[PDB]
Design a protein around this ligand. Structure first.
Ligand SMILES: *[C@@H]1O[C@H](CO)[C@@H](O)[C@H](O)[C@H]1NC(C)=O
Ligand SMILES: *[C@@H]1O[C@H](CO)[C@@H](O)[C@H](O)[C@H]1NC(C)=O
Ligand SMILES: *[C@@H]1O[C@H](CO)[C@@H](O)[C@H](O)[C@H]1NC(C)=O
Ligand SMILES: *[C@@H]1O[C@H](CO)[C@@H](O)[C@H](O)[C@H]1NC(C)=O
Ligand SMILES: *[C@@H]1O[C@H](CO)[C@@H](O)[C@H](O)[C@H]1NC(C)=O
Ligand SMILES: *[C@@H]1O[C@H](CO)[C@@H](O)[C@H](O)[C@H]1NC(C)=O
Ligand SMILES: *[C@@H]1O[C@H](CO)[C@@H](O)[C@H](O)[C@H]1NC(C)=O
Ligand SMILES: *[C@@H]1O[C@H](CO)[C@@H](O)[C@H](O)[C@H]1NC(C)=O
Ligand SMILES: *[C@@H]1O[C@H](CO)[C@@H](O)[C@H](O)[C@H]1NC(C)=O
Ligand SMILES: *[C@@H]1O[C@H](CO)[C@@H](O)[C@H](O)[C@H]1NC(C)=O
Ligand SMILES: [Ca+2]
Ligand SMILES: [Ca+2]
Ligand SMILES: [Ca+2]
Ligand SMILES: [Ca+2]
Ligand SMILES: [Ca+2]
Ligand SMILES: [Ca+2]
Ligand SMILES: [Ca+2]
Ligand SMILES: [Ca+2]
Ligand SMILES: [Ca+2]
Ligand SMILES: [Ca+2]
Ligand SMILES: [Ca+2]
Ligand SMILES: [Ca+2]
Ligand SMILES: [Ca+2]
Ligand SMILES: [Ca+2]
Ligand SMILES: [Ca+2]
Ligand SMILES: [Ca+2]
Ligand SMILES: [Ca+2]
Ligand SMILES: [Ca+2]
Ligand SMILES: [Ca+2]
Ligand SMILES: [Ca+2]
Lengths: 48, 276, 271, 276, 276, 276
């Protein structure tokens, strides 16, 4: 092939993220920003 | 310097119209016809080029400006149609079973395509989006595709056994093929005769107009099925006598060029921008 | 012919459908194929009685058979006040059907042509030549400014260029502003220099078969679809006629009365 | 389950609301493709349904969402057509002389019909208004209609001599017949084989999009001669290979589905609401 | 009328309420009996249809309003029970070993079901949860499911080996199979005779009413083993003579329609949800 | 993006420069080399394509971005040389008696030519000005021009005698012929094997540079006798070994690209003027 072939999957992720940005709350998002996320915390939220 | 592409042109809504320009566009442009060999055969002449040129002169075009070109038929004209010429009018006779190839030729010449090469034997090829196609032109373009999954193994077909490949267009002189966008493919295309280019579709080549001569409007220039727009450059005139057809063209040439435009001409007579 | 003025606050008048039905005449033209498939002969009277419930009086619906499109093309009379013309579609008849539609739907004002004597131009976009007869063969030689043929000799007739052959009807347009010498079959075929006035609203054309093929406008650029060019899908002429009778209200309401002060007396089926 | 049927909604113009319904009695939207069996014969395969399912998965539809309901041909599909799905696509290969059958099938599925029974033997029958037709379905239909009068004497037909009747359709699997609205008719139709239903036309159905594959725009779903409106669901595409057709549909499925609408679905897969 | 949109209804608490509707339901609707063949055989008659119609009209149903339907037996009637009617009564004679068949027939008809299709030989299938079953109907359904772990490997079965599959219903005309919810499954069933559909249970069907004729309460329509409600539309009788059964039904027909109610989906008010 | 119009840009004479674009021109464009077959003949190797490619990579040109195109010789390459590529270099081994042929080829490729057809058999042609020429291309071109009076009578030639006609070009692959401007001409050129085009001279074609490998400065691109300039893109180099020539090219490729620049007519900026 001519390159890697997961850019399609990234495009699908982009399409869903752009619409998913609207369903986010604010007042208790700022506190999440205040909280220090680190390597331990960031990826523990995966689905399963 | 750019020509000013990113600068606005403040206009006005009270400036008076400048006067006509039909005379100047006639005296500058060059009208140009593409007609089948059947037309000359039925006309049974050979001073008819001269007669039509003098008729155009009476209509208001200087002498060395109307150029006639002859092609054997639609499918054979489809193999590398080079519009060598300024205002193109492609007379096109309808007959059953030529719906798709006639539509493909109309698409190819009406729209501007930016084409890149493809090395079929080596690399797999995707289609980026809605505007991309693969255009295959030559003496015998039989195209067989095998789509590959995430594991580079074909789905419904094995890359080794060419019989299992899904044929998508067989024995056409021109084939504009679309495939699901985002899947690598292995193509088996007869490299000796046919050549296949990966072509994006830019805006419309708003210079060439297509005059269908026979049946009902069928030209679906837009490969997408949800939309079948009718361009003003796609004309349709019934016929029995080629002389009557040519006289209609000569009589109504002013309206046809008024529909067409001159600025959308390319230096190359090729019907696409080859960008290597 | 005068400035008519009228406010916008005027209220609507009552529906005029009743008066037009009780005063005007509807008249159908159908091909002999229709009668042959029907295989009847009280069907005219039955269809009249069936129109009666739709509203027309007993005699106001008049049926006029014609053989086929090519034979009906020759000098078609329209003996009525609301004319329907049923045209079966079949291959190779596209331009003949379009020519007949162009002849009847549009309203032509026109003069005769003495082909043997003079040379005839075409003034502009509207002006066509209508050739009608048992079998027309319109040969034309265009002439230069010196009264010499181009691509043809004014004496030799073989060099002439056919624009229509073995046609019962031929609407021919030649390049405007060029003198032309016509050779046309003086016995069978007459030819008339005809200008295209506005539309003829008295008539309407029901195509019975295929797709959009009628092109009333000889221009290539414009292929308009006027309201009076209907098309319906046919498999049984009884079904076609039932459709027409059932939807007669919309057909008549899409047509309109003729507006052209003619000066040539002719037979009309007015009641 | 709306039952605030009458009271009106109010909605502002200058504001896009972040509140909205989240209704779900589903797993996910499901698509279902009806195609003629000649498509399978040309394709000459049998993992091709699986390959198309994989390519739909590429375009985003989940695996269990796409189904394929083969039919033998248009006329045989017209007998009690069934919409077993949410987003229905129906591919129709055009051919000469199949035009009215094809248009009637398209009308039947595209519009929404409210049917009632018709016991021909006992009662006369009538068509109350323009929206009411009679649909004959079965393996062999032959409708003969004898219109009656106020006195109940047949016109152009004797009430008992069946040969005097007028045949509006014969030997069709589907017949959407319109007769003059206001006159009683005595029907004679082959009761052992073909059934007849007195059906009114409600609004349009949206699960079904009809992809015509061959000739020009000929589908006149509206029985009225005057109006022949090309709605957005009667799509057309030219063709020479069924693989090309299917790849086109897969590539542009998102546009097709967002032309269609899932909401107007029905519990039973019948093409009409039968109210006894 | 604002279909396809839930709208709250503000109702008062002290408006004096309307008069009876029994006249309306008798003079508008259509009562619709279903009886087994054994009833006719024991009756040994055949003007009894007319006799019961007269006895109905005595209580005030128009002549065509009452509509008798005859079915061979419970198991053969359960296959595709198409209750296209307005006020349905279904008489079910109880006999031993038919407990589950009667229960699943009642489950199928008493409740409205939305059935998506299934393609067994191509996909694996799940159950969304409590309200989703798989309904299989035909001449001979022998559904053999077997589950799959997350790695697509069967447990208790080998996917390729049908002999290892775990049959869950064999040779039933109708089988409403519930499997463990949230586990992919592979199915095999005799595709030529028996069809299967992924069916989700919506609310109850008010149109139908099941008169069990014979033994004690056995109809546990709710597949959940804990709840076992005796819905008002499941009536019971004790019988020796089908004449006595029909006489009771005719004498108490008013109370039956009081128990029943018009099909909610068929109403105009449910136009753009799942109207049927 | 405001194509077509000639809008006046404005800029300040005190602004600062920007970062160098050398990286971009190496990393995005495509270098493109035409050489004579005697080059490879003297090389007598054959992974030298790969060797040159890797040397170009060391200079900064990615592996797939450099193309090589062997051509037989100057005269047979000048017949319609199509430079469908992005940064073109044309090596030319100068030899005696090919001075005019090499200069004709250089004039053809180093400038943008706008060419219209020429129907020799029908019209009589003219030259608008010094910027107009007639380019004849084919296997064997023998242009014979007969100039005409103001009354369409030849001078020095008879309009009917190709013997009396005056020969201007004879049996060459490429012939850029000029004639007196403002005098109608009648041409005869062997139409079966040598096409001819009436061409106009636009601005210069920066996309391509010429490298004379042999003798002394001779290339007179300007057909005017007076001006015989020396353009930056007309480079010259001495030689004894083709390996040394190619190594010089690779070493100084950055300077050569600096001499050249992207084609003015390949950009969207030139979209609606003569884009190609
Ligand atoms: C432009 O056309 C108008 C038309 O009336 C004419 O009056 C005017 O003179 C023309 N312009 C010039 C520069 O002659
Ligand atoms: C296509 O398949 C044929 C099968 O014989 C083979 O000869 C040919 O080389 C193949 N072409 C390509 C480009 O793979
Ligand atoms: C016209 O209509 C109005 C109301 O729509 C009615 O009162 C009036 O009587 C009608 N005209 C006639 C002449 O009846
Ligand atoms: C048409 O030509 C024929 C022979 O070429 C001639 O006999 C005839 O007179 C011509 N028609 C007219 C109207 O002169
Ligand atoms: C949306 O609806 C909620 C309540 O349903 C309300 O509180 C809010 O103001 C509404 N408007 C928005 C979110 O813009
Ligand atoms: C239709 O006509 C035939 C006469 O050929 C007759 O036998 C039959 O009973 C008629 N059908 C019905 C439903 O009455
Ligand atoms: C209810 O009773 C009142 C008084 O007897 C009567 O006027 C009314 O019509 C009745 N309602 C109906 C629906 O019959
Ligand atoms: C079910 O299993 C049998 C073998 O017992 C096999 O022959 C049949 O094809 C299977 N059915 C399906 C639909 O795969
Ligand atoms: C320009 O190049 C210099 C070094 O060559 C680099 O430090 C600088 O960041 C570049 N400019 C930009 C805008 O990145
Ligand atoms: C050129 O002259 C030759 C005779 O030498 C003649 O046969 C040929 O037709 C001429 N070419 C053209 C285009 O007339
Ligand atoms: Ca295959
Ligand atoms: Ca093609
Ligand atoms: Ca595509
Ligand atoms: Ca399209
Ligand atoms: Ca005609
Ligand atoms: Ca001639
Ligand atoms: Ca004219
Ligand atoms: Ca037209
Ligand atoms: Ca039909
Ligand atoms: Ca009769
Ligand atoms: Ca009707
Ligand atoms: Ca219509
Ligand atoms: Ca087991
Ligand atoms: Ca069962
Ligand atoms: Ca369950
Ligand atoms: Ca239970
Ligand atoms: Ca000489
Ligand atoms: Ca040369
Ligand atoms: Ca010159
Ligand atoms: Ca010079």
């Amino acid at each position: 092939t001519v390159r890697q072939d997961l850019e399609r999957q990234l495009t699908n992720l982009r399409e869903e993220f752009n619409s998913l940005s609207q369903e986010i709350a604010m007042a208790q998002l700022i506190d999440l920003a205040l909280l220090p996320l680190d390597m331990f915390s960031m990826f523990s939220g995966i689905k399963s | 310097q750019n020509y000013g592409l990113n600068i606005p042109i403040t206009g006005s809504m009270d400036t008076v119209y400048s006067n006509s320009t039909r005379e100047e566009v006639f005296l500058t442009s060059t009208l140009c016809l593409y007609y089948p060999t059947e037309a000359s055969t039925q006309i049974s002449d050979g001073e008819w080029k001269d007669s039509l040129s003098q008729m155009f002169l009476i209509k208001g075009w200087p002498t060395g400006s109307v150029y006639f070109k002859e092609y054997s038929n639609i499918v054979d004209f489809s193999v590398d149609p080079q519009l060598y010429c300024d205002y193109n009018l492609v007379l096109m006779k309808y007959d059953q079973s030529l719906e798709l190839d006639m539509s493909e030729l109309a698409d190819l010449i009406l729209n501007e395509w930016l084409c890149n090469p493809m090395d079929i034997t080596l690399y797999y090829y995707q289609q980026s989006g809605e505007s991309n196609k693969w255009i295959s032109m030559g003496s015998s373009c039989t195209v067989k595709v095998c789509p590959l999954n995430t594991q580079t193994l074909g789905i419904g077909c094995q890359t080794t056994n060419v019989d299992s490949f899904e044929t998508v267009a067989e024995n056409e002189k021109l084939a504009i093929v679309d495939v699901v966008d985002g899947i690598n493919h292995k193509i088996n295309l007869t490299t000796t005769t046919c050549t296949i280019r990966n072509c994006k579709k830019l805006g419309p080549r708003e210079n060439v107009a297509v005059i269908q001569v026979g049946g009902a409007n069928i030209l679906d220039i837009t490969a997408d099925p949800t939309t079948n727009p009718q361009i003003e450059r796609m004309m349709r005139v019934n016929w029995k006598r080629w002389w009557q057809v040519f006289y209609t063209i000569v009589d109504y040439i002013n309206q046809i060029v008024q529909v067409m435009s001159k600025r959308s001409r390319s230096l190359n007579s090729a019907a696409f921008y080859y960008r290597v």
